[PDB]
Design a protein around this ligand. Structure first.
Ligand SMILES: CCCCCCCCCCCC[N+](C)(C)[O-]
Ligand SMILES: CCCCCCCCCCCC[N+](C)(C)[O-]
Ligand SMILES: CCCCCCCCCCCC[N+](C)(C)[O-]
Lengths: 366, 366, 366
C-alpha cells in the first residue's frame, strides 16, 4: 500500500527542474564560451535538438528499459510510453511520474555533456545517430545496472548521484569521439553557475526524498565544490603563478563531479578531502585527444569520486557506514569494478555508435 | 475547516518563483536578442517597469477582481490591498497569500509577452496606459472567466494553465498593437531556456498542489516541448534544408504554449501528439503584421492547444477523462467558444487601450 | 522530541539553492556589467574563490561560532566541522544540516556583495585576508547577535532576513574599503534578475518553514520591490526627465533591501510604503567615496528598512504585531541601536581587516 508523500513530490519535481536547468541552458552556455565563436550557434542548436530527442526516447522506451524489471543489464518494454504506470503509481515515496521526469533529466544532462563537447567537429545527423545508439545501449543499461537494481547495484556498488552513470560514462564516450575524429569567459562562468545551482537538484534529488540524506548530499555538494575550487586555484597559483577564471570554474566542476557518487554516503570531513583531491586531480588531468577536457575533468574526477566513496562512506571516516558485512577492502574492489565496467561498456558502445554514423552519413562535418 | 498543507505551500511558493523567473529576466532576454540592438535597453526597462506596475495593480485591485466572488465576468473590490484576507486564510490546500503571488506572476508574464513584443515601436507612457487598461479590462475578466469560477469555467472550459488567459489573450493584444502601429541568438536561447525552466512552475503549479496531476503536467510539459522542437526542426529541415537555433528555440515555445491548456488533463501520448502538431503549426504560422511573431506562435499554438485539449483529455485517448455527462463533441464546442470569447474580448479591449494612449500621449514613439 | 518536517526540509533546501543562485552567478554578473570590462574576469574569479573560501570557513568554524550556544556576541567551537551535530539533529522544524546550508548561503552572498564591489581596486591576496578577518569578526558575531539568540535578538530587535546582518554590515565594510583605497547593461539586468528570484529564497526561507509567514514574506518581497522600482523610476523621471535601465534595476534592489528586515513582520500596505520610501531614498543616496554605490543602496536602504520595520510590524499598521509589552516607541529605539551597533561593529572590523592585509601583502592592486 505505497503512499506518495506530497513533500517528496514537491522536492523531486523542483529537483527535476534544477537538473533540467543544467542542460538548458547550463551545459549549452558552458561550452558556448569555450568553443570557437563561429561554432556556437550550431552547438546550442545541437544540444537543444538532442535534448529534445532524449526527452522523447526516454518516454517511448528509455524509462521502461532503464527502470523496468528485467535482468542484470536492462529492464523491459511494457512501460512503453509509460503504459501500465497508473498516474497514481508510487515509486519510493513519490509518484512514479516524477521518477520518470527525474531520471529523464539525468539522461538529458549526460547526453548534453557529450553533445556539447563534440558539436564542433561532428556532423549533425551523425550525432543524432550516435545519441540514439549510445543512449540506448550505454546510458540505459548502465542506469539500469547502477540505479535500476541491476548488476552493479546487486553487488553493492556505491554511486549516489552518477559518477559512473553520468560522468565516467560520458567522459569515455567523449574520448572515443575525439580519438576517431575560450572566447566568452563570462558565458563560461554563467554556465558553471547554472550547472552548480542545477547540481543541488541532481545530488539532493538522488535521495528521492527531502530527508537527512538529501540534507547531507546538499551540504557535501557545497563543501566539496568549494574545496575543489580552492585546491585547483592553489595548484594553478603554484603551477602558473596565478588563478584564472577558467581554473576556478574548472575547480568547481572537478569537485561537483568528485562528490557526485559520494555526496549521500560521506561526512563533511570526507566531502572536503574529496573536493581537494578532485580539484587537484582535475587540474593534473587537463595538464596531461580530449574534447573540451571532458575526460580530464569528468573522467579523472569521476574515477576519483567513485574510488573515494569506497573509503569515505565508512562510519569511522564520518560516512553513513558501509552495508552489513562489507569491509572497506571489498567495497573498494566493487567500486573499481563499477568503474572498469562503465569505462569498457561506454567505450565499446561509443565505438559502435560513431561507426554506425560514420558508415551511414559520415562523422567529419562536411 | 480548510487546512493549509505545508508541502503544497512549499511547492506553490517555489512555482511562483519559477513563473516570476519567466518574466525577470526570461521574456526580457528572449526579446533582448531578437530586437534591434539599439532598442534593447529601452525594452528591458519597459518590461521591468511594467512588471512592477503589474505587481502593484494585482495587489491593489487585481487579485480582488480576478478572484473574488462576483458575476460571470469579474469578482469584486473588498480584497483591495488584500483586506479581509486573513494571513492564515486557505485557498485550496495552500495559504491564500501564495495563491495571490502565484496568480499575480501569471499576470506579470502575460503582460511581459505583450510589452516585450511592442517595446520597440510604442511610447513608454503609451504602453503604461495600455497595460493599465488591458490588465484591468481584459486579463482580469478572462482570468476570472476561466480560473475565477466565471463564465467559461461554469460552462466546462478546459484550460489548465492559460492557453486563453495567457497565450491567446496576449497574442491578440499584440496583433491589435501591430495593426494600429535577430542580433544576439545566444541571448535568445538563454531566454528560451529560462522560459522553459520557469514554465514548469506555471504548468505544474496550476495544479495548486504537489500531487499526481502536478506530476502529469510536469511530465507532459517535458514531452510536448521536446515533440514540438523536433516537429519544428524537422519541418524547418524540409522547408529550409536545415534546422536553425531560432527554429529550435521557437519549437520549444510552440509546444510549451500548445501544452499549456492541456498539460493537466492529457496522457503522454497526447502530450507528444500535441507537441508535434503545435511545433508544425507554429512553424506554419510564422511562415504565414505580427510583432516578433507573437501571434504566429502564441496565437496559433494557443488555439491548437485549447482545441486539442477538448480531444486528448478523453480517457479513451489517455486523458484524465471529461467531466460527467460531457462528450468530446460538446467539450470541443466549449473550447471553440472559450477561444472565440478570448480573441474578441482581448481584441476589443486592446483596441480601447491603445486608442486611449493614442488620444492622451500618442502611440508612435517620438 | 523535535521532529523534522519533510515539507520544511524541501522548502529550505530549495531556498538555500536560491540564495546560492544570488552569489553564483547573481552578484557576479550584476557587478560584471558595471565595472570596467578590463576588470571583469579578475572580479568573477575573486567572487568565485571567495565564495569557496566562505563555504569552507562556514563549515570549519563559521556555523559553530555563528550559531552555537555561547555569549551575547559569539557561539562556540564544538560544532567544528559540524561535529556533535547528528545527521538527524533537528533545528526548528528542519534538519540542522539544512540550517547550516541556509545560513552559510547568507554568509556567502554578504561576502559576495563586498568582494564584487571592491574587486576592481584591491589585491587578490589582500581581499582573501580581509574576507577571513571580516567574516570571522564581523559577519559571524552580528549573525550570532541577531539570528543566533545573541545581544540584539535578546533585546527584541526585528530583522527578519538581514537588513543588519547582510546589508548594513556589508555596506559599511564596503565604505571603509573605498575610504582607505557601466559597460554591459543587459548583464547588469540579468544579475538584478537572478538576484531578485534568488531573494525569495532569502526572504521566505528566513521563515524556516513553508507557512503563512513564509507566504507573507514572499508577497511583501514582490510588492516592495515593485513599489521601489516605480518610486525610483518616477524620481528619476523627475530628476533626469527619463527612467533608465540602471535606475530600474537599482530600484528593484533598493526595495529588496528595504523589505529584507521587514518582510516577515509587515502587511502588504507596509510592504508598498516601504518599497516606495526605499526606492526614493536609494535614489537620493546615489545622488549624494562609495564603490558601486554599495552604501548608497544597501546602507541607505538597509537603514530605512530596519527603522521602518520598527513601525510597520505594528498590528495597527497591518503587521504581525510587536511582542508583548513592546511599544512602537521602544521598538524603534531598539532598531536604532541594532543599526548603530552594526555600523560601528562592521566599520571597526573592516578597518582591522583591510589594515592587516595592507600590512602583510598590501591593498593597492600592484
Ligand atoms: C549528479 C548529476 C551530474 C550532472 C552531470 C553534468 C556535468 C556538468 C559539467 C560540465 C563541464 C564540462 N567539462 C568541460 C568540464 O568537461
Ligand atoms: C503556463 C504559463 C504560460 C506562460 C506564458 C509566457 C510565454 C513565453 C514565450 C515567449 C515567446 C515569444 N514569442 C516571440 C514566441 O512570441
Ligand atoms: C535576505 C538576503 C539579502 C541578500 C543580499 C544580497 C544583495 C544583492 C544586491 C546587490 C546590488 C549591489 N549594489 C550595487 C546595489 O550595491
Amino acid at each position: 500500500p505505497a503512499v506518495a508523500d506530497k513533500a517528496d513530490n514537491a522536492f523531486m519535481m523542483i529537483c527535476t527542474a534544477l537538473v533540467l536547468f543544467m542542460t538548458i541552458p547550463g551545459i549549452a552556455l558552458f561550452y558556448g564560451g569555450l568553443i570557437r565563436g563561429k561554432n556556437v550557434l550550431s552547438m546550442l542548436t545541437q544540444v537543444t535538438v538532442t535534448f529534445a530527442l532524449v526527452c522523447i526516447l526516454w518516454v517511448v522506451y528509455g524509462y521502461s528499459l532503464a527502470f523496468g524489471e528485467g535482468n542484470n543489464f536492462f529492464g523491459n518494454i511494457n512501460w512503453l510510453m509509460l503504459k501500465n504506470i497508473e498516474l497514481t503509481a508510487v515509486m519510493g515515496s513519490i509518484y512514479q511520474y516524477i521518477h520518470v521526469a527525474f531520471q529523464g533529466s539525468f539522461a538529458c544532462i549526460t547526453v548534453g555533456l557529450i553533445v556539447g563537447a563534440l558539436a564542433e567537429r561532428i556532423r549533425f545527423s551523425a550525432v543524432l545517430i550516435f545519441v540514439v545508439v549510445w543512449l540506448t545501449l550505454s546510458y540505459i543499461p548502465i542506469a539500469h545496472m547502477v540505479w535500476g537494481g541491476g548488476l552493479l547495484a546487486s553487488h553493492g556498488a556505491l554511486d549516489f548521484a552518477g559518477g559512473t552513470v553520468v560522468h565516467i560514462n560520458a567522459a569515455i564516450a567523449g574520448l572515443v569521439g575525439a580519438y576517431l575524429i575560450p572566447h566568452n569567459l563570462p558565458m563560461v562562468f554563467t554556465g558553471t553557475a547554472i550547472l552548480y545551482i542545477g547540481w543541488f537538484g541532481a545530488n539532493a534529488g538522488s535521495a528521492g526524498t527531502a530527508n537527512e540524506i538529501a540534507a547531507l548530499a546538499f551540504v557535501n555538494t557545497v563543501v566539496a565544490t568549494a574545496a575543489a575550487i580552492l585546491g585547483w586555484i592553489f595548484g594553478e597559483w603554484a603551477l602558473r603563478g596565478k588563478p584564472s577564471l577558467l581554473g576556478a570554474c574548472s575547480g568547481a566542476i572537478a569537485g561537483l563531479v568528485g562528490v557526485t557518487p559520494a555526496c549521500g554516503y560521506i561526512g563533511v570531513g570526507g566531502a572536503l578531502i574529496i573536493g581537494v583531491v578532485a580539484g587537484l586531480a582535475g587540474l593534473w588531468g587537463v595538464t596531461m585527444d580530449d574534447p573540451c577536457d571532458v575526460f580530464g575533468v569528468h573522467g579523472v574526477c569521476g574515477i576519483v569520486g567513485c574510488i573515494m566513496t569506497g573509503i569515505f562512506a565508512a562510519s569511522s571516516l564520518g560516512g553513513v557506514g558501509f552495508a552489513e558485512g562489507v569491509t572497506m577492502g571489498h567495497q573498494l574492489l566493487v567500486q573499481l569494478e563499477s568503474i572498469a565496467i562503465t569505462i569498457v561498456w561506454s567505450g565499446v558502445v561509443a565505438f559502435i555508435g560513431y561507426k554506425l554514423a560514420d558508415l551511414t552519413v559520415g562523422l567529419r562535418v562536411p
